[PDB]
Design a protein around this ligand. Structure first.
Ligand code: NA
Ligand SMILES: [Zn+2]
Length: 293
């Protein structure tokens, strides 16, 4: 006996739409540090792109007061739910704000936050049109990922430390099959680093997803270990994967970290081709996680 084979293939992710959304997000809210009017415009942009989910009761605002070196700061995570047909949740996440210490330069985070906020908005468009047939998919737009003063275990990851604690306390973490973080994947010169902090079965699955989507040339050139929004989940036993390109721009004596955290992180540094690859990988990861069961 056997299942009847499916006669239709899934719709493809729209990378050009994700690129256009990045341009629109940067136009609407170029500087987005916590507390600023630009941050509020960024939040309005996200909400304006999830009106159906808001009307359906599938959009959550998770507001909290963070203790930071700059004092008490209000932060807001946003969670958009696409319920599936079986119990269990795949979370896709991105940060959406820009660095507070960079508030007085023209830092707009086009790749760093912008491209992945757009990626997940486009994922919402995709999932609204093509509802998930396996696990639920939840989209997380997290606040306060970047250090308020200087990166450390206490000054970073405010939104995900809060969200991981909230979901631990209420039992939600038990349901998470995988937490998939998108970070800095609009880079015109794209290669996803192999993050040793990510869960091995998810790293192996991303290598398989790249094979399946014809994108092996873009995955795992460099091996490293990344401190990012997946750590508060990983430290509580949640399977995590950081789909990140941390090698952003040419490293030189004067720019030892390339375009990362400089005013050169602009829209001319990202491409629809890279966002297409990223979205293809995310959709294939969802299929493979569903298959793993
Ligand atoms: Na790169
Ligand atoms: Zn950053």
């Amino acid at each position: 006996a056997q299942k009847a084979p499916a006669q239709n293939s899934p719709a493809r992710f729209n990378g050009q739409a994700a690129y256009n959304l990045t341009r629109q997000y940067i136009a609407a809210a170029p500087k987005r540090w916590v507390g600023s009017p630009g941050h509020a415009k960024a939040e309005a942009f996200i909400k304006d792109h999830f009106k159906p989910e808001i009307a359906q009761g599938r959009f959550e605002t998770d507001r909290f007061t963070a203790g930071t070196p700059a004092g008490l700061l209000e932060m807001r995570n946003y969670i958009v739910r696409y319920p599936g047909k079986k119990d269990g949740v795949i979370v896709l996440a991105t940060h959406y704000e820009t660095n507070y210490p960079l508030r007085d330069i023209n830092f707009v985070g086009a790749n760093d936050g912008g491209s992945t906020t757009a990626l997940l908005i486009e994922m919402g468009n995709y999932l609204r049109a093509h509802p998930p047939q396996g696990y639920s998919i939840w989209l997380v737009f997290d606040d306060g990922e970047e250090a308020i003063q200087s990166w450390s275990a206490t000054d970073s990851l405010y939104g995900t430390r809060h969200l991981a604690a909230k979901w631990s306390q209420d039992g939600t973490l038990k349901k998470i099959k995988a937490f998939l973080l998108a970070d800095m994947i609009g880079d015109k010169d794209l290669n996803i680093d192999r993050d040793a902090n990510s869960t091995p079965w998810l790293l192996d699955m991303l290598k398989q997803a790249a094979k399946n989507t014809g994108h092996s040339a873009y995955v795992f050139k460099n091996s490293t270990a990344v401190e990012d929004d997946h750590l508060p989940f990983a430290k509580r036993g949640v399977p995590v994967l950081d789909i990140i390109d941390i090698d952003y721009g040419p490293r030189t004596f004067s720019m030892p970290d390339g375009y990362h955290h400089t005013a050169e992180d602009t829209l001319d540094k990202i491409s629809a081709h890279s966002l297409q690859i990223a979205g293809d990988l995310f959709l294939e990861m969802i299929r493979l996680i569903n298959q793993r069961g």
